[model samples]
Target: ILQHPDGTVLKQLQPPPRGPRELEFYNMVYAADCFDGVLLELRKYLPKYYGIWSPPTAPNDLYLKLEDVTHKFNKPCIMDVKIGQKSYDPFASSEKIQQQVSKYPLMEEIGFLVLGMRVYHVHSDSYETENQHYGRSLTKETIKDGVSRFFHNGYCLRKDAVAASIQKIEKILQWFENQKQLNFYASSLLFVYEGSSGGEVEVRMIDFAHVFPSNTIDEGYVYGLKHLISVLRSILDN
Candidate 1:
């Protein structure tokens, strides 16, 4: 993510032949009028599209530029969510395995949840600094470790705040389900912005690098989302 002096932000993508998948996804979203309705509906949750940019010296080289949603916040708390086996580990222990089969258990048999947080603070020199960071890789094992630490050692968020965040996440999962027929699955970053009036907060999704095109619904993604939501709900309820 690159920021301009004029307060505009641009996300540069690798030039094709071997370019990033996210670049292709954005290009597809831009070119296809069939996606207009979907894009319009998702506009509230996604960054604004600013079209493509090519440097004068490298006219053939293309890059995607998008609105910097981070600029909409006074302080931004970016959290990444990815559901997979390593993150949840249903078979890690007998207790977890038993819970998997139980009603209202910690997680479902099919999916896993990994959560991470990074706080971005504005500085005089650059808009690129984090005050605090958490979570490791999105892999199952690393996510398992990170979550273990979160539950055991605790973090800065209050119980109510965590619950509120979970509620927003639940809505996002619902939206994904509504569009499951489109077969879009990608790790998404949830942006929580502070300083909204009436103590309200803003949440938006980001990152589409791993989004794939498929005809059938991705059960793994659905399962992962369910498991994550269940776990967070359990955490808050208990």
Candidate 2:
């Protein structure tokens, strides 16, 4: 969170042994050809990775240069949703898994969890914020309200905006239903729409810091996506 974020998002390198996991995941997608199947289609649901960069004076300060998805928006209403049956992977230590289990024990049943969000209030000409604690406070019965709040601008509910977002999320759901090549842990789906531009919606899968190759299908992600899509659909209908 900087005062001046430009057209690019520079993600800082994680300490020591783990950072390359993310860069390598991006490379696989970048290097893959048409025959790579789902990997090629993944491009549609992720920010463009433009390699790496660092300040000329500090070569040690490496960052992953990526498309700034919010750069084009006048007032961006954004949501960060971390989705998975298990946020901790097999690669994680038991201590790591313990926090994942206790922090959101309900994640297994909910399929996903809302990390946080920023809603741009057009009528008031400002923004409202929600944090991870608010996200952790959500229960199955209250999730509809929790999610509905994101589309509401403190003025009124924006059905058109939510509808447009669901359509894009649905595309990711359909894509996830087919693949068996990878499984994601601690990954998130980022949702953004222009509160000022009506229905200019965008959705992308982000944070590959713990991606794993799988021999079989990723039931965790597939299940979470269905649950997520269903929630959005229910919100629209009511």
Top-scoring candidate (lDDT)? 2
Query: Residues 1-238, candidate 1, lDDT per residue (tens digit)?
Result: 6786654666666554224767766666666565566545655566667677878799776666777665665555455554433222312367654553342222234354334555433332222322223432334434443433332212233344456656776776666666644443334545354421323344556666556555655566667666656655666644
lDDT tens string, model 2, 1-238? Answer: 2222668888876775457788888888877455687888888889988886788899988777888888888888899999899999887788999988888988999988999999988778888999999888998999888889899887678888788878898898788777878889879998898887467888889888888998877888888888888888888887
TM-score of each: 0.62, 0.94
In model 2, which runs have C-alpha deviations exceeding 4 angstroms? 1-6, 32-35
Question: What lDDT would candidate 1 get against the real structure?
Answer: 0.51
Output the TM-score of candidate 2: 0.94
Clash count of each predicted structure: 2, 0
lDDT of 2 at 88: 93
What TM-score does prediction 1 earn? 0.62
Local distance difference test, each candidate = 0.51, 0.84
Query: Number of the top candidate by TM-score?
Result: 2
Error of 1 at 140 (Å): 8.5
